[PDB]
Design a protein around this ligand. Structure first.
Ligand SMILES: Cc1cc2nc3c(=O)[nH]c(=O)nc-3n(C[C@H](O)[C@H](O)[C@H](O)COP(=O)(O)OP(=O)(O)OC[C@H]3O[C@@H](n4cnc5c(N)ncnc54)[C@H](O)[C@@H]3O)c2cc1C
Ligand SMILES: NC(=O)c1ccc[n+]([C@@H]2O[C@H](COP(=O)([O-])OP(=O)(O)OC[C@H]3O[C@@H](n4cnc5c(N)ncnc54)[C@H](OP(=O)(O)O)[C@@H]3O)[C@@H](O)[C@H]2O)c1
Ligand SMILES: Cc1cc2nc3c(=O)[nH]c(=O)nc-3n(C[C@H](O)[C@H](O)[C@H](O)COP(=O)(O)O)c2cc1C
Length: 606
């Protein structure tokens, strides 16, 4: 993991006074950072954005060597209040270092979600440490909330941020600037055009270890069957073959996949923009110094970039609608698009209802504002990167060392846009039929693990697809037994709507219970009666016995599935169990369950 040379030197050579660092798992903090960097130019300053994993942040002590210098951290919080994977080296440095940051000016925008226990843990930490190390905060810590609207929190913070920067440094605010230039390739050889590979040219057709985010392994789809019994939704079990990939995983780990966008959606964007999507091109950085040569692997076709490199499905952010406004020939449509970027009033409210709440993707916006006819080259520079999708691996490597199993609900909903929207990755996984049907993937290691000693009892709470990793856990616990190992009680609390609708792994779980692999199979059918039966109803019922396992057997409790509501209700039930059988007050119950649910006991998403 070889760091770039000093970022202070880079910015000294390039004539930049502001650097903006992104802690980003799924690219939102990265987008915020590039926007702040560009923003610099409109205030007589020069900005760059940087991936902190690539630099040694100790070079912060050198940043005062540059006049009227400033560092901004856009820091997403991931996991159970941990840093993003790219921010982990920064985090571990901040803890260990006692460097003197005297004369360093800083500001932090945290990206977080209130529904999560540790709201912007990473934002707040970074903000606090730089101070403790002797750096001067030039503007208040921003607490962005994805639970509300994060975009609107960024608008509000940025709008106040720049005036204060201008005020402090004694500089003054002063027109569409493009980051990249279009180059069309007429006479290009087929063998040097990217076709959806993420890393090296021909990484896909030409597979060579080691496999990771930058070089995903193309795993063959062994299996892909309907799990759910009814037709109400589509829940799907997939087995990916990682034979000869040299990939190592444990139960509780995550599998990331790189999907393709819907063909019809891509062609429609092309048709409505009157564009030739089969043109071969590059968008090359106009700043010849930046290592970011292109916004995505180039040269390549618009069709390819729209299929594998670009997000064409999520509600576009305000700066993308703002940049497009110029290409709207009807003054009213130009006005709406321009005002999407307001921090207040009618424009903000239109952006929240018409774009966000209605889940309008770029194509819908082009259709509903027919006067908006951008050129495909700028659109492709503006759209964000298509991100990998993570899934809890539904198999144990002890049992299935050459296969990675996925348990997923297909996303397909009716939006206020009047359109039916489709999950990019789930629609694409669904269409994979068992040359071979190939899925670019890699493994991200998690802290979500079985207890070290087999005698330790496990309690697993995993309604709906929340069961994904517990299938692995149960496979593995079953395996230890049949290897003559001594295994504690193994308790599954699972949930679904009906026995005959969405009872995932019904046959497989019946089996495990008969063999003794599951000590108890407790299932809550939330719609087999007038009232809701949920997992925390079964938890409260088993309160006496669950306390025995927790207090006397040091049982590990695992909780996977919906972050918003399920995980909070489950935790309140555990607080209520501890408070009875301690005894102790509610305050000490909460301390107790917090200490029990240490990093690697919650696997939550929403
Ligand atoms: C660590 C982790 C583990 C995960 N494990 C699993 C797993 O085991 N199984 C699983 O199925 N998924 C899992 N997910 C979710 C997964 O990553 C994907 O987000 C999910 O499969 C949908 O991706 P997609 O590309 O199909 O949808 P996308 O195209 O990315 O769309 C997702 C968005 O659709 C919108 N949406 C969905 N339904 C509606 C609705 N009714 N109304 C309005 N908007 C709606 C929401 O805005 C949501 O953010 C996990 C996620 C993480 C981060
Ligand atoms: N607007 C949106 O963005 C939106 C809307 C829908 C789904 N989603 C997402 O899509 C996924 C749905 O997948 P899934 O099949 O795993 O979920 P699911 O089937 O809807 O949930 C599984 C089970 O959990 C139960 N449950 C619901 N609320 C609960 C609570 N507070 N406590 C305990 N149990 C509860 C459900 O009962 P009941 O359903 O009968 O209550 C059901 O039996 C989730 O990740 C969800 O966040 C998003
Ligand atoms: C698996 C997962 C875990 C998360 N954990 C936290 C958390 O512990 N605290 C928090 O405030 N936000 C949490 N979030 C919310 C994210 O910080 C938020 O979505 C943010 O915008 C992600 O930014 P990024 O795209 O740059 O990664 C989590 C999101 C996911 C998907």
């Amino acid at each position: 993991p070889v760091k770039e040379s000093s970022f202070v030197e880079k910015m000294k050579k390039t004539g930049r006074n502001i650097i903006v660092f992104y802690g980003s798992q799924t690219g939102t903090a990265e987008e915020f950072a590039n926007r702040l960097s560009k923003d610099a130019h409109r205030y007589g300053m020069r900005g760059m954005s940087a991936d902190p994993e690539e630099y040694d942040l100790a070079d912060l002590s050198s940043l005062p060597e540059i006049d009227k210098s400033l560092v901004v951290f856009c820091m997403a919080t991931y996991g159970e209040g941990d840093p993003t994977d790219n921010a982990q080296d920064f985090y571990d440095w901040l803890q260990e270092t006692d460097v003197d940051l005297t004369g360093v000016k800083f500001a932090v925008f945290g990206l977080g979600n209130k529904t999560y226990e540790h709201f912007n843990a990473m934002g707040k930490y970074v903000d606090q440490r730089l101070e403790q190390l002797g750096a001067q905060r030039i503007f208040e810590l921003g607490l962005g909330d994805d639970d509300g609207n994060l975009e609107e929190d960024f608008i509000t913070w940025r709008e106040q941020f720049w005036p204060a920067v201008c005020e402090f440094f004694g500089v003054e605010a002063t027109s569409s600037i493009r980051q990249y230039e279009l180059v069309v390739h007429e006479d290009m050889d087929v063998a040097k055009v990217y076709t959806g590979e993420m890393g090296r040219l021909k990484s896909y057709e030409n597979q060579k270890p080691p496999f990771d985010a930058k070089n995903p392994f193309l795993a063959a789809v062994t299996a892909n069957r309907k799990l759910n019994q009814g037709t109400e939704r589509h829940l799907m079990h997939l087995e990916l073959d990682i034979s000869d990939s040299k990939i190592r995983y444990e139960s509780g780990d995550h599998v990331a996949v790189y999907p393709a966008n819907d063909s019809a959606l891509v062609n429609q964007i092309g048709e409505i923009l009157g564009a030739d999507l089969d043109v071969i091109m590059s968008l090359n950085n106009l700043d010849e110094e930046s290592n970011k040569k292109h916004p995505f692997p180039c040269p390549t076709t618009y069709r390819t970039a729209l299929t594998y490199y670009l997000d064409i499905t999520n509600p576009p952010r305000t700066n993308v609608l703002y940049e497009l406004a110029q290409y709207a020939s009807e003054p009213s449509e130009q006005e709406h698009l321009h005002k999407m970027a307001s921090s207040s009033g009618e424009g903000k409210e239109l952006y929240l209802s018409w774009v966000v709440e209605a889940r309008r993707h770029i194509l819908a916006i082009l259709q509903d504002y027919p006067s908006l006819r951008p050129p495909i080259d700028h659109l492709c520079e503006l759209l964000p990167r298509l991100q990998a999708r993570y899934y809890s691996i539904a198999s144990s490597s002890k049992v299935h060392p050459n296969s990675v199993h996925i348990c997923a609900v297909a996303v397909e909903y009716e939006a206020k846009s009047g359109r039916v929207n489709k999950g990019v990755a789930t629609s694409w996984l669904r269409a994979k039929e068992p040359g071979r049907a190939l899925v670019p993937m890699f493994v991200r290691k998690s802290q979500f693990r079985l207890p070290f000693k087999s005698t330790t009892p496990v309690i697993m709470v995993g309604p709906g697809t929340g069961i994904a990793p517990f299938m692995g856990f149960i496979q593995e616990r079953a395996w230890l037994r049949e290897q003559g190992k001594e295994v504690g009680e193994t308790l599954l609390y699972y949930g679904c709507r009906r026995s005959d609708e969405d009872y995932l792994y019904r046959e497989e779980l019946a089996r495990f219970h008969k063999d003794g692999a599951l000590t108890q199979l407790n299932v809550a059918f939330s719609r087999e009666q007038a009232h809701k039966v949920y997992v925390q109803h079964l938890l409260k019922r088993d309160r006496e016995h669950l306390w025995k396992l927790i207090h006397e057997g040091g049982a590990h409790i695992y909780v996977c599935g919906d972050a918003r509501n399920m995980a909070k209700d489950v935790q309140n039930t555990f607080y209520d169990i501890v408070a009875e059988f301690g005894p102790m007050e509610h305050t000490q119950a909460v301390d107790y369950v917090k200490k029990l649910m240490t990093k690697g006991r919650y696997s939550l998403w929403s």
